[PDB]
């Protein structure tokens, strides 16, 4: 598990943005302040749900280890999702937000595989949850996860 | 006899292999 000196410093910088009074904990109120600066307006119940899911020891506030543990997991999810989004843009040759059978067939060709229309149509139907005849990003991601 | 089908995940991973 990688955590360099520089990575630790960056986590403390992010933590300090939340930890308004520098006591080493993040409360629901400090989280509200940050969320409002992002243009959101959560209720106290919503803030408590956000704290609760990060608050591993259940003492009501977020300490650095809890914060870093959650942030590192979120960063990995975001990295992984971005890799999936990049693949989707590559497959979606005309950039219209759907992978068509023809696009999928050309993709296969470029990867050294020759499929018939029949075979690619099958692959599309497999992923085409909403029945529009093509594969959108949500449908693609569902096949990856 | 029959043709084997490819998966969406295998396609994704095949691209992953070919990139720098
Ligand atoms: Ca604080
Ligand atoms: Ca805690
Ligand atoms: Ca397209
Ligand atoms: Ca669809």
Q: Is A93 exposed, middle or buried (0-12, 13-18, 19+ CB in 10 A)?
A: middle
Roughly how many angstroms between the first and final C-alpha of chain A, as a whole number?
A: 23
A145: its two tokens: 């996860």
Identify the experimental approach: X-ray
> Could you tell me the resolution of this structure in angstroms?
1.9
A21 in a labelled binding site: yes
Locate the domains of chain A by residue range.
1-77, 78-145
The answer to whether the CB atoms of A143 and B9 lie below 8 A apart is yes
- Which chain B residues are within 8 Å of A140, Cβ to Cβ? 8
Q: Which residue in chain A has the smallest CA separation from B12? A: A87
State the Cα–Cα distance between residues A49 and A129, nearest whole angstrom: 31
The Å distance, Cα A94 to ligand 4 centre, comes to 16
State the Cα–Cα distance between residues A1 and A70, nearest whole angstrom: 14
CB-based contact (8 Å) between A127 and chain B?
Answer: yes
């Amino acid at each position: 598990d990688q955590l360099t000196e520089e990575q630790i410093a960056e986590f403390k910088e992010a933590f300090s943005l939340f930890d308004k009074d520098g006591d080493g904990t993040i409360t629901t109120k400090e989280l509200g302040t940050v969320m409002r600066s992002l243009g959101q307006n959560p209720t106290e119940a919503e803030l408590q749900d956000m704290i609760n899911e990060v608050d591993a020891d259940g003492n009501g506030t977020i300490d650095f280890p809890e914060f870093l543990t959650m942030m590192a997991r979120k960063m990995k999810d975001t990295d992984s999702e971005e890799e999936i989004r990049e693949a989707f843009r590559v497959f979606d040759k005309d950039g219209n937000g759907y992978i068509s059978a023809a696009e999928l067939r050309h993709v296969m060709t470029n990867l050294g595989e020759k499929l018939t229309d029949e075979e690619v149509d099958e692959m599309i139907r497999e992923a085409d949850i909403d029945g529009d005849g093509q594969v959108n990003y949500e449908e693609f991601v569902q096949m990856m996860t | 006899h029959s043709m084997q089908a490819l998966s969406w995940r295998k396609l994704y991973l095949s691209r992953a292999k070919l990139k720098a």
